[PDB]
């Protein structure tokens, strides 16, 4: 249309940034909880057909052995952000021989957001914002940390953040169940309780993903047997 | 309209609406107060939290050993500007082995921000900066606008409901010069209180203070470190 | 109508409205006057303070594009500063190539072409500031050129740019500028600024004064505070 | 519409040749009229 | 810039490329171009629209172009755009399908990125086994035994769909078929040799021969067909 | 006067085959309100234009539409002042480049033929507007003699025995056409007189020796010089006495 | 610069901007080209709107090589750009082959330039049609390059204003046995029907090509040919 | 260079150019792929079969590598660019890792290439969807589907094209372990799925198969006609 990508609304809003924020509400619901024992990441696969293999829907991605990311919105757009995160990490390791902090990893991915333009831009520069919200979760010097990223490039640490279609409903339920001093098992259980209530389908060990990053331990993808153990309760 | 879709279109009234639209992004941001004395220049910021389960967005960023800023507006644009001023301050040390003067830095970001407001398809930096620094010329408080126009201010407040703080700063601007560090910070906290609603109060969670002085490096204070400043001021009437 | 959305489109009457609209920004700013006397040029800018919070010296509309050439601006300040840097780099390049201070006629003719280059294409917008360049040398003499957003540079004896330009021009015409010196003009430049200022309208202005002449050895310097206060007192007394 | 026009024109070809039975040649000449030209 | 941009390489709400379709309409108003595959050769009959009697006859052919020693092509649409494509076609030249694919990648490129208008040319390619190819401004290419592009292409394809006996065709049968198909497609009831353009590709002595039939040879084909058509009139 | 699309906003053809943007640039020449007259004689060429100084504040020494492109070539600019200087600066660069590249002074005919080539690009590419100025070069050729060439925003160019550009171009053209019909190879004095008279008669001003600028090139001195107020007054006195 | 094509396909499959460019050609001064047995003639109406214009300053019929000539109908400034490009193109052919460029080859190169401006971004098509005449292999050549970039080999054609009736006039007045001098006579006659007022030796421009090469007829020569008309 | 944002966010948060590209897929021929036990099957409807059309040139089933082949649905010209781009990367991966490309990798690259065209200046999205089938180095059959947005999923059986919704509904009900017990049964499942949208019959069915440790094999029309008779024969005994 007549409007460019880098255009400001009369209310001070970047039009394309706000529009990309609306794209997250069409994505699957992802729940991340920060706990002193670790960070739990939950997301719904949203199976649309019995023939589709649930294993192919990877909505929780290993950024590194100590940090994982949960995605919501446009999954195809998050691959570029994830690849840069997995490239920025192992670049800090190459130069400083240490694992990058979760805040720094989120900050590096955040700088990729808003680097979109129509004119006076590089040939490889993007044209539109990344219509995906990321939920970075991992352990570092500051212990377990959960960070939420939005298509606006604004990243902030969150004790318990829910993103996606049911972000409004799940966040309200998260506040009713989150306390600072709890265990990771409660955080995993509470996330599955909230997810089960917001999913269109019925919760089972094949239509969801659960990830935990514990201190000492590495990023871990919950298997079907592990998922069935916690689902069998609620 | 047809004059508000691009930054290179002059309105018939001699105005650029995209520049003014970007200026409203600062007004959407949270209030920050920057004031200075004969020997100190402090920044007081009111961090905002999207939800009570999320942390308060950082508002004061360290640029150089003697220069510190408080952002207001698009966080991504602030990082782009803050990185630029960090690099320019670093480049002065690498070349001249001297701190970059604050007046000579805001000119650079006033020209860096002016280029996008004049070329087709570019947008103004939707962030407002309150720059505090100390150099040979004394403490400074610079306010940066998305219009690429900067002001050398005795005491300025930008953000949402910042004009309530501008009133308090104007009323007590006379006693800013001779007051010590503790009184200077309290004035900014008192000014930042005017931007809050009646029921809200200054707490350690939503207050950040940055101090740069003659013999003091620029240091940012947080929830634990705001307590030595917050307890002094009395409750507002 | 679509005939005014770009600088690369002509109106059916053959006028570039984007350049004309950019001139309106200059007419919305405070007036800035400059008078060329017998032995120099004195610049006087009526610099309002939008609030008491700004320090004395903020939004300096008087620039130093070279050691001998000044610049008084009116309109959008950001483009004024950008054009000051363009004028600064034009003088630096001239010295780095030809080996002497750039003549005002060449500097005015060079910066104006940069200003004019922004009035031809839709990829850029015309500059929203008009500025006056003043210089003095023993050989060339006192010179004063005004460049508008369109890119027209003309030498002047007394020029005014801003919202009170038309009223300021009438007060300049009374002066016998071709005979008096800088020391006498600085009193009158203050008087003209105080006369054209509107106290019921936007008030609380700061008188910014600068000059370049044989009394400064052809160097553009801010008028000394002691003389500036004397000029301010004379201007205030002239208002009765 | 093309199918109905093919049939209607095909009958018109038979009416020209004074016939009540529509042949394949009548339909063949029908297609080259409505669909083409 | 954005105001004056027509956005040629964008998708319509129905998933269509409007510029590609509009270019395909230009070919529909162009001269008729035929191509028939036989067991011993391929021919390319093109309708001549430059039939003004003050038009000089200097070039070897008007719409028939030789790409390489083994290949010939004929164009329909914007003639200026045809010169760009034919000049590029010789630069790439090699197998017949390889040459068409390479050019069709160029044509598809203009329909995806660049912002320029598509090449409004549909080409018929003949080369040596023997194969006939058709290309569209979208870059969609496909082999054909008998196909037509240009004015009344749909009518000509219907005639070929009925009268092209697959496998059992020589040049003479294919050449006679081309004239008969061109006769109905053309608005001219006579179809003189000056309004048509026939080029035949054959393998001789181990070499590919690309020859444009002389005006005298074509008149024999027109004369033979009209007598053959008149022979059917004796039946009725 | 049909329109279809952006034919009035960018240099693209109208349905009847017209470039309105280029046409609008011609109306831009009249925006300055000044008229220039150039007359060519047997051994001299003269450019005459009115100079308007609305206020005494303006330095009249700077308000000049006469520009010395090179030593042997001068021009008079009509139209936007800002666009005029760019063409003059562009013409000076091309003249200097011609001298460096080819070793001899650029001919008057080839000077605008280059300038008209630059201004033609403005009428074909749509991202920039045509320069709303008119250029009239006068100079003494080595063999052809005095030369006058108008150089319009459209990229058109032609030689002229006597031409004019500005608001009163067609009024002055009719006057000069009448004088040329008499077929007189005017001397240097007569060319200045008919150039001043053409601007005087059309405008009806009765010029003073401060309201017009005269630039002459002669075969005896093939250099472009501006007539001073003392020199210009002699011709005005001669005009009054006859 | 604009990187998007300003010429696009209409819904009815026409490059509309090209058609408007051809309208500018139809509003230009008439140009007539006749290919005789022993040469080619190029004639055009070089009529000015006043006597102040120097007739010999700007020539509508310009040579390209020692044997190729141009004459146009359309926008004057656009023709000078194509004249330089054609002259540049002829030099490029001459440098690499050390042989004067064939008339047919030049038309393809020039028409390719014209075609580029139909598809290139931010530009409009040339508003002229180029009549190209030349002599190669002992045979005369005459070509027409439309704004679209399509080139036609013409035995006798007319462009510009009143070209439809000029083409008809050439239909009944041209034969392949015409000689160069009679072609000049016929070319002047073709202009006369579209000409308004009287044709002098200065208001029309004639150029011819033969074995000796292409040269533009001087005003003295055109006067002698014009005398045979009356 | 043309640097313009073709694909931009709609106010509701949708990429319309991506959605419009997906509409072009819905206008293409129906392509059906079924992943069996020891064989992977691709079935493509041949739309309209003109007797004068060389069926060899018009082929919607193409082999990216010796172990990976895909069938597309959408703009034929757009798909060929993707196939050639994937074919080039198939050889680049082979020269680097000294191992044939996995079905995930070539699907990931094609999907990433698709997404790049939905977020790059001056480029419209690819208007094709691909049904990538093949065998990994361990012999596990794999079937993948990509869409113009740039998303990829693994499917036991899937359909793309105009009749995708009906066939996928058919595949949801008939895809069982018994139905993929043998290669012949896996072949018959595709034809049954294709015959739900193909009207005339086996004439408009182009079926290609790939077996483990074997190259892609295109079924001749007689073989397809032989299979169609079996489904027709088996239909009678079930009535």
Swiss-Prot record, chain D:
Subcellular locations according to the entry: Cytoplasm; Nucleus; Membrane
Q: What does this protein do?
A: Component of the 26S proteasome, a multiprotein complex involved in the ATP-dependent degradation of ubiquitinated proteins. This complex plays a key role in the maintenance of protein homeostasis by removing misfolded or damaged proteins, which could impair cellular functions, and by removing proteins whose functions are no longer required. Therefore, the proteasome participates in numerous cellular processes, including cell cycle progression, apoptosis, or DNA damage repair.
Q: How does it assemble?
A: Component of the 19S proteasome regulatory particle complex. The 26S proteasome consists of a 20S core particle (CP) and two 19S regulatory subunits (RP). The regulatory particle is made of a lid composed of 9 subunits, a base containing 6 ATPases including PSMC1 and few additional components. Interacts with SCA7. Interacts with NGLY1. Interacts with PAAF1.
Q: So which disease is it linked with?
A: Birk-Aharoni syndrome: An autosomal recessive disorder characterized by failure to thrive, severe developmental delay, intellectual disability, spastic tetraplegia with central hypotonia, chorea, hearing loss, micropenis and undescended testes, as well as mild elevation of liver enzymes.
The family assignment reads:
Belongs to the AAA ATPase family.
Recorded protein name is: 26S proteasome regulatory subunit 4
Organism listed in the record? Homo sapiens
Curated annotation (Swiss-Prot), chain E:
Q: Per its UniProt record, what InterPro entries does this chain match?
A: Ntn_hydrolases_N (IPR029055), Proteasome_alpha (IPR050115), Proteasome_alpha-type (IPR023332), Proteasome_asu_N (IPR000426), Proteasome_bsu_CS (IPR016050), Proteasome_sua/b (IPR001353)
Query: Where does the UniProt annotation locate this protein?
Result: Cytoplasm; Nucleus
Which positions carry Phosphoserine? 12, 74, 158
Give the superkingdom in one word: Eukaryota
Q: Which PANTHER family match?
A: PROTEASOME SUBUNIT ALPHA/BETA
Q: What does this protein do?
A: Component of the 20S core proteasome complex involved in the proteolytic degradation of most intracellular proteins. This complex plays numerous essential roles within the cell by associating with different regulatory particles. Associated with two 19S regulatory particles, forms the 26S proteasome and thus participates in the ATP-dependent degradation of ubiquitinated proteins.
Protein's UniProt name = Proteasome subunit alpha type-4
The organism encoding this protein is Homo sapiens (Human)
Q: Its gene? A: PSMA4
Curated annotation (Swiss-Prot), chain F:
Residues where Phosphoserine is found: 14, 60-61
Please verify whether the record's keywords include Nucleotidyltransferase. Answer: no
In terms of InterPro entries, this protein maps to: Ntn_hydrolases_N, Proteasome_alpha, Proteasome_alpha-type, Proteasome_asu_N, Proteasome_sua/b, Proteasome_subunit_alpha6
Q: Give the keywords, sorted.
A: Acetylation, Cytoplasm, Glycoprotein, Nucleus, Phosphoprotein, Proteasome
**One cellular component GO annotation, for this chain's record?**
cytoplasm
Q: Where in the cell is it found?
A: Cytoplasm; Nucleus
Please describe the quaternary structure of this protein: The 26S proteasome consists of a 20S proteasome core and two 19S regulatory subunits. The 20S proteasome core is a barrel-shaped complex made of 28 subunits that are arranged in four stacked rings. The two outer rings are each formed by seven alpha subunits, and the two inner rings are formed by seven beta subunits. The proteolytic activity is exerted by three beta-subunits PSMB5, PSMB6 and PSMB7. Interacts with ALKBH4.
The protein's name is Proteasome subunit alpha type-6
Organism this protein belongs to: Homo sapiens (Human)
From Swiss-Prot, chain G:
What UniProt keywords are attached to this protein's entry? Acetylation, Cytoplasm, Nucleus, Phosphoprotein, Proteasome
What result follows from mutating residue 106 to V?
In a colorectal cancer sample; somatic mutation
The protein's gene is named: PSMA2
Sites bearing Phosphotyrosine, chain numbering = 2, 20, 72, 117
Origin species, per record, is Homo sapiens
**Where's it mainly located?**
cytoplasm
Post-translational events? Phosphorylated on tyrosine residues; which may be important for nuclear import.
| Modification N6-acetyllysine, positions | 66, 167
State where the protein is found. Answer: Cytoplasm; Nucleus
Question: Could you describe the subunit structure of this protein?
Answer: The 26S proteasome consists of a 20S proteasome core and two 19S regulatory subunits. The 20S proteasome core is a barrel-shaped complex made of 28 subunits that are arranged in four stacked rings. The two outer rings are each formed by seven alpha subunits, and the two inner rings are formed by seven beta subunits. The proteolytic activity is exerted by three beta-subunits PSMB5, PSMB6 and PSMB7.
UniProt-recorded name of the protein: Proteasome subunit alpha type-2
What is the protein's known function? Component of the 20S core proteasome complex involved in the proteolytic degradation of most intracellular proteins. This complex plays numerous essential roles within the cell by associating with different regulatory particles. Associated with two 19S regulatory particles, forms the 26S proteasome and thus participates in the ATP-dependent degradation of ubiquitinated proteins.
Recorded hits in CDD domains, A to Z, give: proteasome_alpha_type_2 (cd03750)
Its induction note reads: Down-regulated by antioxidants BO-653 and probucol. Down-regulated in response to enterovirus 71 (EV71) infection (at protein level).
| Phosphoserine carried by residues | 3, 10, 12
């Amino acid at each position: 249309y007549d409007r460019g990508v880098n255009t400001f609304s009369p209310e001070g809003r970047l039009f394309q940034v706000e529009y990309a924020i609306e794209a997250i509400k069409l994505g699957s619901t992802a729940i991340g909880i920060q706990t002193s024992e670790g960070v739990c990441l939950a997301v719904e696969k949203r199976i649309t057909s019995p023939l589709m293999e649930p294993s192919s829907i990877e909505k929780i991605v290993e950024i590194d052995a100590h940090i994982g990311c949960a995605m919501s919105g446009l999954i195809a757009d998050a691959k570029t952000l994830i690849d840069k995160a997995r490239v920025e990490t192992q670049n800090h390791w190459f130069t400083y021989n240490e694992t990058m902090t979760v805040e720094s990893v989120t900050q590096a991915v955040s700088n990729l957001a808003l680097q979109f333009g129509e004119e006076d831009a590089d040939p490889g520069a993007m044209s539109r914002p990344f219509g995906v919200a990321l939920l970075f979760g991992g352990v570092d010097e500051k212990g377990p940390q959960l960070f939420h990223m939005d298509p606006s490039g604004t990243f902030v640490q969150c004790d318990a953040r829910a993103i996606g279609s049911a972000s409004e409903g799940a966040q309200s339920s998260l506040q009713e169940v989150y306390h600072k001093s709890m265990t990771l098992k409660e955080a995993i259980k509470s996330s599955l309780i909230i997810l089960k209530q917001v999913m269109e389908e019925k919760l089972n060990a094949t239509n969801i993903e659960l990830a935990t990053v514990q201190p000492g331990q590495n990023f871990h993808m919950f298997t079907k047997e592990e998922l069935e153990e916690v689902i069998k309760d609620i | 309209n047809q004059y508000d879709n691009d930054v290179t279109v002059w309105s018939p009234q001699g105005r650029i609406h995209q520049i003014e639209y970007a200026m409203e992004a600062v007004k959407q941001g949270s209030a920050t107060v920057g004031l200075k004395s004969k020997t100190h220049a402090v920044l007081v910021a009111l961090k905002r939290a999207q939800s009570e389960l999320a942390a308060h967005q950082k508002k004061i960023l360290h640029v150089d050993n003697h220069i510190g800023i408080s952002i207001a507006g698009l966080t991504a644009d602030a990082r782009l500007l803050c990185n630029f001023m960090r690099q320019e301050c670093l480049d002065s040390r690498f070349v001249f082995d001297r701190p970059l003067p604050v007046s000579r830095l805001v000119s650079l970001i006033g020209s860096k921000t002016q280029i996008p407001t004049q070329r087709y398809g570019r947008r103004p930096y939707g962030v407002g900066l309150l720059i505090a620094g100390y150099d040979d010329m004394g403490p400074h408080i610079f306010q940066t606008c998305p219009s690429a126009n900067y002001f050398d201010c005795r005491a300025m407040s930008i953000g949402a409901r910042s004009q309530s703080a501008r009133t308090y700063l104007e009323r007590h601007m006379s006693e800013f010069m001779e007051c010590n560090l503790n009184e200077l910070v309290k004035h900014g906290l008192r000014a930042l209180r005017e931007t809050l609603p009646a029921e809200q109060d200054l707490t350690t969670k939503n207050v950040s203070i940055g101090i740069v002085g003659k013999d003091l490096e620029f240091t940012i204070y947080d929830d634990d470190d705001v307590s030595p400043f917050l307890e002094g001021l009395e409750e507002r009437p | 109508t679509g005939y005014d959305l770009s600088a690369s489109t002509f109106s059916p009457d053959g006028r570039v409205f984007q350049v004309e609209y950019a001139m309106k920004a200059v007419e919305n700013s405070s007036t800035a006057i400059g008078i060329r006397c017998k032995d120099g040029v004195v610049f006087g800018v009526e610099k309002l303070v939008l609030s008491k919070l700004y320090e004395e010296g903020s939004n300096k509309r008087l620039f130093n594009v070279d050691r001998h050439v000044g610049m008084a601006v009116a309109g959008l300040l950001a483009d004024a500063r950008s054009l000051a840097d363009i004028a600064r780099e034009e003088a630096s390049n001239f010295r780095s190539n030809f080996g002497y201070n750039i003549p005002l006629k060449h500097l005015a003719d060079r910066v104006a072409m940069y200003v004019h280059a922004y009035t031809l294409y839709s990829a850029v917008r015309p500059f929203g500031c008009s500025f006056m360049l003043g210089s003095y040398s023993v050989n060339d003499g006192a010179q004063l050129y005004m460049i508008d957003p369109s890119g027209v540079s003309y030498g002047y004896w007394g020029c005014a740019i801003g919202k009170a330009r038309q009223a300021a021009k009438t007060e300049i015409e009374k002066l016998q500028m071709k005979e008096m010196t800088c020391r006498d003009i600085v009193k009158e430049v203050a008087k003209i600024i105080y006369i054209v200022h509107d106290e019921v309208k936007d008030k609380a202005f700061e008188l910014e004064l600068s000059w370049v002449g044989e009394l400064t050895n052809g160097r553009h310097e801010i008028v000394p505070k002691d003389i500036r206060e004397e000029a301010e007192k004379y201007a205030k007394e002239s208002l009765k | 519409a093309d199918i109905k026009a093919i049939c209607t024109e095909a009958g018109l070809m038979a009416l020209r040749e004074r016939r009540m039975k529509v042949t394949n040649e009548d339909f063949k000449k029908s297609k080259e009229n409505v669909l083409y030209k | 810039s954005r105001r004056y941009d027509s956005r040629t390489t964008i998708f319509s709400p129905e998933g269509r490329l409007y510029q590609v379709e509009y270019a395909m309409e230009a070919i529909g108003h162009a001269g008729t171009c035929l191509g028939i595959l036989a067991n011993d050769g391929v021919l390319l009959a093109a309708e001549r629209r430059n039939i003004h009697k003050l038009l000089d006859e200097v070039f070897f052919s008007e719409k028939i172009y030789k790409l390489n020693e083994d290949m010939a092509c004929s164009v329909a649409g914007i003639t200026s755009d045809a010169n760009v494509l034919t000049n590029e076609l010789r630069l790439i030249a090699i197998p017949c399908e390889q040459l068409v694919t390479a050019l069709c990648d160029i044509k598809q490129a203009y329909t995806q990125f660049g912002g320029k208008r598509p090449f409004g040319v549909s080409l018929l390619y003949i080369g040596w086994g023997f194969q006939l190819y058709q290309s569209d401004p979208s870059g969609n290419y496909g082999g054909w035994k008998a196909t037509c592009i240009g004015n009344n292409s749909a009518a000509a394809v219907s005639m070929l769909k009925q009268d092209y006996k697959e496998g059992e065709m020589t040049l003479k049968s294919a050449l006679a078929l081309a004239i008969k198909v061109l006769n109905k497609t053309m608005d001219v009831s006579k179809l003189s040799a000056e309004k048509v353009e026939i080029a035949t590709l054959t393998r001789e002595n181990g070499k590919t021969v690309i020859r444009v039939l002389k005006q005298k040879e074509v008149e024999q084909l027109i004369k033979k067909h009209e007598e053959e058509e008149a022979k059917a009139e004796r039946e009725k | 006067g049909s329109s279809a699309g952006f034919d009035r906003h960018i240099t693209i053809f109208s349905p009847e085959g017209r470039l309105y943007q280029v046409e609008y640039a011609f109306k831009a020449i009249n925006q300055g309100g000044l008229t220039s007259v150039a007359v060519r004689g047997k051994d001299c060429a003269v450019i005459v234009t009115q100079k308007k100084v609305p206020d005494k504040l303006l330095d009249s020494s700077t308000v000049t539409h006469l520009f010395k492109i090179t030593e042997n070539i001068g021009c008079v600019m009509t139209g936007m002042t800002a666009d005029s200087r760019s063409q003059v600066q562009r013409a000076r660069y091309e003249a200097a480049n011609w001298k460096y590249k080819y070793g001899y002074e650029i001919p008057v005919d080839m000077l605008c033929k280059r300038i008209a080539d630059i201004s033609q690009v403005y009428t074909q590419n749509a991202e920039m507007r045509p320069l709303g100025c008119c250029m009239i070069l006068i100079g003494i050729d080595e063999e052809q003699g005095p030369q006058v060439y108008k150089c319009d925003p459209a990229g058109y160019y032609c030689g002229f025995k006597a031409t004019a550009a500005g608001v009163k171009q067609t009024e002055s053209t009719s006057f000069l056409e009448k004088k040329v019909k008499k077929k007189f190879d005017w001397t240097f004095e007569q060319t200045v007189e008919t150039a001043i008279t053409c601007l005087s008669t059309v405008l009806s001003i009765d010029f003073k020796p401060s309201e017009i600028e005269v630039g002459v090139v002669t075969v005896e001195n093939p250099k472009f010089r501006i007539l001073t107020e003392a020199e210009i007054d002699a011709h005005l006195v001669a005009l009054a006495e006859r | 610069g604009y990187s998007f094509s300003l010429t696009t396909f209409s819904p009815s499959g026409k490059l509309v901007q090209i058609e408007y460019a051809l309208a500018a050609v139809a509003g230009g001064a008439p140009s007539v080209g006749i290919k005789a047995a022993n040469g080619v003639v190029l004639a055009t109406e070089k009529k000015q709107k006043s006597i102040l214009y120097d007739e010999r300053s700007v020539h509508k019929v310009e040579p390209i090589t020692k044997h190729i000539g141009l004459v146009y109908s359309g926008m004057g400034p656009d023709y000078r750009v194509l004249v330089h490009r054609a002259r540049k193109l002829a030099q490029q052919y001459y440098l690499v082959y050390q042989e004067p460029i064939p008339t047919a080859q030049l038309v393809q190169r020039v028409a390719s330039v014209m075609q580029e401006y139909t598809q290139s971004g931010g530009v409009r098509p040339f508003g002229v049609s180029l009549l190209i005449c030349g002599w190669n292999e002992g045979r005369p050549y005459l070509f027409q390059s439309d704004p679209s970039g399509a080139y036609f080999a013409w035995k006798a054609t007319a462009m510009g204003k009143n070209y439809v009736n000029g083409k008809t006039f050439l239909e009944k007045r041209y034969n392949e046995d015409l000689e160069l001098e009679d072609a000049i006579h016929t070319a002047i006659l073709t202009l006369k029907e579209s000409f308004e007022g009287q044709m002098t030796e200065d208001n029309i421009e004639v150029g011819i090509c033969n074995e000796a090469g292409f040269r533009r007829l001087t005003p003295t020569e055109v006067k002698d040919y014009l005398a045979a008309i009356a | 260079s043309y640097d313009r944002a073709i694909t931009v966010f709609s106010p509701d948060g949708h990429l319309f150019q991506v959605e419009y590209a997906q509409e072009a897929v819905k206008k293409g021929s129906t392509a059906v792929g079924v992943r069996g036990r020891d064989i992977v099957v691709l079935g493509v409807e041949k739309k309209s079969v003109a007797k004068l059309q060389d069926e060899r040139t018009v082929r919607k089933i193409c082999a990216l590598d010796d172990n990976v082949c895909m069938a597309f649905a959408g703009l034929t010209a757009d798909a060929r660019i993707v196939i050639n781009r994937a074919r080039v990367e198939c050889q680049s991966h082979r020269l680097t890792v000294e191992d044939p490309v996995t079905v995930e990798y070539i699907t990931r690259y094609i999907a990433s290439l698709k997404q790049r065209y939905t977020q790059s200046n001056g480029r419209r999205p690819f208007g094709i969807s691909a049904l990538i089938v093949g065998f990994d180095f361990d012999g596990t059959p794999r079937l993948y589907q990509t869409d113009p947005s740039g998303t990829y999923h693994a499917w036991k059986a899937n359909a793309i094209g105009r009749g995708a919704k009906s066939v996928r509904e058919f595949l949801e009900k008939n895809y069982t372990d018994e139905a993929i017990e043998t290669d012949d049964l896996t072949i018959k499942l595709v034809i049954k799925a294709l015959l739900e949208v193909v009207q005339s019959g086996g004439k408009n069915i182009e079926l290609a198969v790939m077996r483990r440790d074997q190259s892609l094999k295109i079924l001749n029309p007689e073989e397809i006609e032989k299979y169609v008779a079996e489904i027709e024969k088996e239909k009678e005994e079930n009535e």
